[PDB]
Design a protein around this motif. Structure first.
Motif, mmCIF file in Angstrom:
data_model
loop_
_atom_site.group_PDB
_atom_site.id
_atom_site.type_symbol
_atom_site.label_atom_id
_atom_site.label_comp_id
_atom_site.label_asym_id
_atom_site.label_seq_id
_atom_site.Cartn_x
_atom_site.Cartn_y
_atom_site.Cartn_z
ATOM 1 N N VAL A 1 -5.616 -3.059 -8.687
ATOM 2 C CA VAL A 1 -5.125 -1.811 -8.109
ATOM 3 C C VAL A 1 -6.322 -1.015 -7.606
ATOM 4 O O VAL A 1 -7.239 -0.704 -8.377
ATOM 5 C CB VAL A 1 -4.310 -0.997 -9.125
ATOM 6 N N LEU A 2 -6.313 -0.684 -6.316
ATOM 7 C CA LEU A 2 -7.386 0.080 -5.687
ATOM 8 C C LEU A 2 -6.904 1.509 -5.465
ATOM 9 O O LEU A 2 -5.981 1.746 -4.678
ATOM 10 C CB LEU A 2 -7.820 -0.561 -4.370
ATOM 11 N N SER A 3 -7.530 2.457 -6.155
ATOM 12 C CA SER A 3 -7.209 3.870 -6.020
ATOM 13 C C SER A 3 -8.214 4.527 -5.084
ATOM 14 O O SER A 3 -9.426 4.348 -5.241
ATOM 15 C CB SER A 3 -7.218 4.565 -7.382
ATOM 16 N N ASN B 1 7.572 -11.114 -13.900
ATOM 17 C CA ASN B 1 8.697 -10.187 -13.979
ATOM 18 C C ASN B 1 8.268 -8.728 -14.064
ATOM 19 O O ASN B 1 9.126 -7.845 -13.966
ATOM 20 C CB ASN B 1 9.575 -10.525 -15.186
ATOM 21 N N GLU B 2 6.976 -8.453 -14.235
ATOM 22 C CA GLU B 2 6.490 -7.102 -14.475
ATOM 23 C C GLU B 2 5.671 -6.537 -13.323
ATOM 24 O O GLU B 2 5.271 -5.370 -13.383
ATOM 25 C CB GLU B 2 5.661 -7.075 -15.765
ATOM 26 N N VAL B 3 5.405 -7.329 -12.280
ATOM 27 C CA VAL B 3 4.624 -6.828 -11.153
ATOM 28 C C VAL B 3 5.384 -5.732 -10.416
ATOM 29 O O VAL B 3 4.774 -4.828 -9.830
ATOM 30 C CB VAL B 3 4.240 -7.988 -10.215
ATOM 31 N N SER B 4 6.718 -5.777 -10.445
ATOM 32 C CA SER B 4 7.521 -4.740 -9.808
ATOM 33 C C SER B 4 7.341 -3.375 -10.458
ATOM 34 O O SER B 4 7.781 -2.373 -9.882
ATOM 35 C CB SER B 4 8.999 -5.136 -9.832
ATOM 36 N N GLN B 5 6.715 -3.308 -11.634
ATOM 37 C CA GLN B 5 6.458 -2.038 -12.300
ATOM 38 C C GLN B 5 5.127 -1.410 -11.904
ATOM 39 O O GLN B 5 4.962 -0.195 -12.063
ATOM 40 C CB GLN B 5 6.495 -2.219 -13.821
ATOM 41 N N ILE B 6 4.178 -2.197 -11.401
ATOM 42 C CA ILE B 6 2.897 -1.657 -10.958
ATOM 43 C C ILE B 6 3.097 -0.986 -9.605
ATOM 44 O O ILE B 6 2.670 -1.503 -8.566
ATOM 45 C CB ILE B 6 1.817 -2.751 -10.894
ATOM 46 N N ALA B 7 3.763 0.164 -9.613
ATOM 47 C CA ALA B 7 4.084 0.905 -8.403
ATOM 48 C C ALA B 7 4.382 2.344 -8.796
ATOM 49 O O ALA B 7 4.710 2.614 -9.958
ATOM 50 C CB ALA B 7 5.284 0.279 -7.672
ATOM 51 N N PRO B 8 4.262 3.290 -7.864
ATOM 52 C CA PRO B 8 4.561 4.685 -8.205
ATOM 53 C C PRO B 8 6.023 4.859 -8.591
ATOM 54 O O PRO B 8 6.926 4.335 -7.936
ATOM 55 C CB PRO B 8 4.221 5.448 -6.919
ATOM 56 N N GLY B 9 6.245 5.604 -9.671
ATOM 57 C CA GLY B 9 7.588 5.906 -10.125
ATOM 58 C C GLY B 9 8.359 4.710 -10.646
ATOM 59 O O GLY B 9 9.489 4.461 -10.218
ATOM 60 N N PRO C 1 0.622 7.180 -10.760
ATOM 61 C CA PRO C 1 1.225 8.494 -10.507
ATOM 62 C C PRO C 1 2.318 8.415 -9.451
ATOM 63 O O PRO C 1 2.474 7.424 -8.737
ATOM 64 C CB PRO C 1 0.043 9.339 -10.026
ATOM 65 N N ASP C 2 3.089 9.502 -9.362
ATOM 66 C CA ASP C 2 4.166 9.560 -8.381
ATOM 67 C C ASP C 2 3.626 9.740 -6.969
ATOM 68 O O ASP C 2 4.227 9.245 -6.008
ATOM 69 C CB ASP C 2 5.130 10.694 -8.729
ATOM 70 N N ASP C 3 2.504 10.440 -6.824
ATOM 71 C CA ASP C 3 1.828 10.620 -5.541
ATOM 72 C C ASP C 3 0.656 9.660 -5.382
ATOM 73 O O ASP C 3 -0.404 10.038 -4.875
ATOM 74 C CB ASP C 3 1.366 12.066 -5.387
ATOM 75 N N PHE C 4 0.824 8.413 -5.813
ATOM 76 C CA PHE C 4 -0.273 7.454 -5.794
ATOM 77 C C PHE C 4 -0.656 7.098 -4.363
ATOM 78 O O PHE C 4 0.205 6.782 -3.536
ATOM 79 C CB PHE C 4 0.113 6.193 -6.566
ATOM 80 N N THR C 5 -1.955 7.149 -4.076
ATOM 81 C CA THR C 5 -2.504 6.775 -2.777
ATOM 82 C C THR C 5 -3.426 5.579 -2.981
ATOM 83 O O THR C 5 -4.521 5.722 -3.536
ATOM 84 C CB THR C 5 -3.255 7.942 -2.136
ATOM 85 N N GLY C 6 -2.984 4.409 -2.537
ATOM 86 C CA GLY C 6 -3.765 3.203 -2.716
ATOM 87 C C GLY C 6 -2.926 1.975 -2.426
ATOM 88 O O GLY C 6 -1.811 2.068 -1.907
ATOM 89 N N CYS D 1 0.834 -1.193 0.000
ATOM 90 C CA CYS D 1 0.000 0.000 0.000
ATOM 91 C C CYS D 1 0.873 1.247 0.000
ATOM 92 O O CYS D 1 1.893 1.305 0.693
ATOM 93 C CB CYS D 1 -0.930 0.020 1.213
ATOM 94 N N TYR D 2 0.464 2.243 -0.781
ATOM 95 C CA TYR D 2 1.210 3.483 -0.940
ATOM 96 C C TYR D 2 0.329 4.650 -0.520
ATOM 97 O O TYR D 2 -0.825 4.748 -0.949
ATOM 98 C CB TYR D 2 1.677 3.670 -2.388
ATOM 99 N N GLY D 3 0.872 5.525 0.326
ATOM 100 C CA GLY D 3 0.163 6.703 0.777
ATOM 101 C C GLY D 3 -0.908 6.468 1.819
ATOM 102 O O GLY D 3 -1.429 7.444 2.375
#
Ligand SMILES: *[C@@H]1O[C@H](CO)[C@@H](O)[C@H](O)[C@H]1NC(C)=O
Lengths: 215, 220, 195
Positions: C180-182, C73-81, C94-99, C47-49
């Motif tokens: 992904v839950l935003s 190999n691509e799950v590490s990309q589903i993250a901010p930045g 987004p870089d300020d992703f909250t979720g 979870c981010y933010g």
């Protein structure tokens, strides 16, 4: 990082043979692999992409196979313009790298030929400079695999010698090798017997050409 | 005309800086995956850097913090800015258009980069005299030792080109001193060694050195 | 007192391709995050933010549920930045992703013996994706100066590639379902609370 182990390092084949090269990844890369052909001094040439798809313009005698970790390139009928060095690449974008194989050199297969061994003492002109270079020559042999062991007063010398091999001769398909043993003038004058011992497939027993310092 | 043209390579001392250019026609650099691949002398291929069409760049661990890939869309040119160069960066540098799963289809001719702390030096030419021990049977061998020069390459001929059969000029080796060493030998019939004189002609354009060395039997 | 349809997103039998990711607008309902606390041994729950234990104590205006399928190999990309073919050309956060981001290995569901080429991904794109952008275009990508005019060939490639999920592949090349839950909270009445 993924490690792409390619085998064999070199193989001999005549025209028309069925040639097979193996490429192994250290972990499952599915179908993300490509094959390339390279000739000395030229840029690489794409042969197979997506493990088994033939690049446009490549003759149909080329074919790729395998998935996961084990991959094989296959030339159904070797042609004269196919004697070159082949590489495999991991096109997978994880972990980046795009690692290439070690490479497989495919030379022209011919009958075994034993090398002619010649030893050359350092020149008097060079000894005046302070460095003694002894050269051992292996002339016109086949196959490429040949072992040169320097002996100084019957002491096996390693670490102070360098070798160089010519490309497969375009007329008799043989190789030629030179080995240069370099010493300071001081160490050269400390010993008497200088020899290079050549072992090769065409030799049933090792051949030794030697001289004595100052004879 | 689909081609990639490299330039900018050359000789530079360690720590120096060098910028390689890759002029493209046919393929658009700003629209493709463009990669730099290098190959050291006698070694395999090594991927260096890639630039996505969207701008994402990726570098190998060995060149992270030293190399910077870039492009000029108006010039249709790919660039590789190489700083803090090391000896192990010596290689032929190819620019190429990467198609990811479809392989790498378009390759440039390559530009040569040599990184060494060595100065330009002319080679010493020493004779490899045909002795009694240099005669297996019926034919003997003689040659020249082109030692201690920089940079590559040298060209060696025999009797001003009159002697071509049986001549083997080996590729140079890089000595621990950083200077190249090279040998060129020729096998002739033992009957001609003292009615025909053998001179090797060594030419080294980087040092403006042309040396002609006569190879004669050694005198006991 | 409607319950937020989380069952419809996670327990869906088929997921969409990553380039055409599905988005379910969830609003005006009572959300139960305790069933997403710990679903199974798969603990992809970064979870981010926002904190997971604090979700039951927060009200949001709208909750977006984005679902798709990629490789391991691509799950590490589903993250901010993050950067890569997936992050730049398929689904960018987004870089300020909250979720929170959730993923689980679905090799037993989305991989066939002959290759499950149904799931696709975008390989070619002229520029990177903005956050929460969905590009479903299938126009022939022009990689050279000559115009394509919808003609697939050299320098004119189809911008989508298949995954070919086989169950014997490596873990990194096995299919993973991502949800992904935003969590949005703008000037609006908050309707998605917890209990
Ligand atoms: C989805 O269904 C499975 C059984 O089919 C169940 O174990 C799981 O709790 C369900 N998840 C949700 C969020 O309802």
């Amino acid at each position: 990082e993924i490690v792409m182990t390619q085998s064999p390092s070199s193989l001999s084949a005549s025209v028309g043979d069925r040639v097979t090269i193996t490429c192994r990844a250290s972990q499952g890369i599915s179908s993300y692999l490509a094959w390339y052909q390279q000739k000395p001094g030229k840029a690489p040439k794409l042969l197979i992409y997506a493990a088994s798809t033939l690049q446009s313009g490549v003759p149909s005698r080329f074919s790729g196979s395998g998935s996961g970790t084990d991959f094989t390139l296959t030339i159904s009928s070797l042609q004269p313009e196919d004697f070159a060095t082949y590489y495999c690449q991991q096109l997978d974008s994880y972990p980046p790298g795009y690692t290439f194989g070690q490479g497989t050199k495919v030379d022209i297969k011919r009958t075994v030929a034993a090398p002619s061994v010649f030893i050359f003492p350092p020149s008097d002109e060079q000894l005046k400079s302070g460095t003694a270079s002894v050269v051992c020559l292996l002339n016109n042999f086949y196959p490429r695999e040949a072992k040169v062991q320097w002996k100084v007063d019957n002491a096996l010398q390693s670490g102070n010698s360098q070798e160089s091999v010519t490309e497969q001769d375009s007329k008799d398909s043989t190789y030629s090798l030179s080995s240069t043993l370099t010493l300071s003038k001081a160490d050269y004058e400390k010993h008497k017997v200088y020899a290079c011992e050549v072992t090769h497939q065409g030799l049933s027993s090792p051949v030794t050409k030697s001289f004595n310092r100052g004879e | 005309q689909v081609q990639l043209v490299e330039s900018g390579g050359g000789l530079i001392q360690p720590g120096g800086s060098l910028r390689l250019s890759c002029a493209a026609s046919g393929v658009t650099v700003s629209s493709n995956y463009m990669s730099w691949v290098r190959q050291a002398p006698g070694k395999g291929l090594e991927w260096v850097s890639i630039i996505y069409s969207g701008g994402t760049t990726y570098y190998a661990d060995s060149v992270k913090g030293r190399f910077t890939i870039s492009r000029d869309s108006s010039m249709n040119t790919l660039y590789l800015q190489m700083n803090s160069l090391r000896a192990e960066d010596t290689a032929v540098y190819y620019c190429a258009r990467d198609l990811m799963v479809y392989g790498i289809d378009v390759w440039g001719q390559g530009t040569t980069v040599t990184v060494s702390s060595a100065s330009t030096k002319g080679p010493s030419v020493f004779p490899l005299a045909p002795s009694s021990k240099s005669t297996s049977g019926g034919t003997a061998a003689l040659g020249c030792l082109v030692k201690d020069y920089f940079p590559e390459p040298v060209t060696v001929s025999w009797n001003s080109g009159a002697l071509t059969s049986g001549v083997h000029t080996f590729p140079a080796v890089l000595q621990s001193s950083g200077l190249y060493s090279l040998s060129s030998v020729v096998t002739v019939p033992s009957s001609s060694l003292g009615t025909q004189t053998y001179i090797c002609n060594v030419n080294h354009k980087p040092s403006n050195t042309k040396v002609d060395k006569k190879v004669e039997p050694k005198s006991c | 007192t409607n319950l937020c349809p989380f069952d419809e997103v996670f327990n869906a039998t088929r997921f969409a391709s990553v380039y055409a990711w599905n988005r379910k607008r969830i609003s005006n309902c009572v959300a139960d995050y305790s069933v997403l606390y710990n679903f199974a041994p798969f603990f992809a729950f970064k979870c981010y933010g926002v904190s997971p234990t604090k979700l039951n104590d927060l009200c949001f205006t709208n909750v977006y549920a984005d679902s798709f399928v990629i490789r391991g190999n691509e799950v590490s990309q589903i993250a901010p930045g993050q950067t890569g073919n997936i992050a730049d050309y398929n689904y960018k956060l987004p870089d300020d992703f909250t979720g929170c981001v959730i993923a689980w290995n679905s090799n037993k569901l989305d991989s066939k013996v002959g290759g499950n080429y149904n799931y696709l991904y975008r390989l070619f794109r002229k520029s990177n994706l903005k956050p929460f952008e969905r590009d479903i275009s299938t126009e022939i990508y022009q990689a050279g100066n000559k115009p394509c005019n919808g003609v697939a060939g050299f320098n004119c490639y189809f911008p989508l590639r298949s995954y070919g999920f086989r169950p014997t592949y490596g873990v990194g090349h096995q299919p993973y379902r991502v949800v992904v839950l935003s969590f949005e909270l703008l000037h609006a009445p908050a309707t998605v609370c917890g209990k």
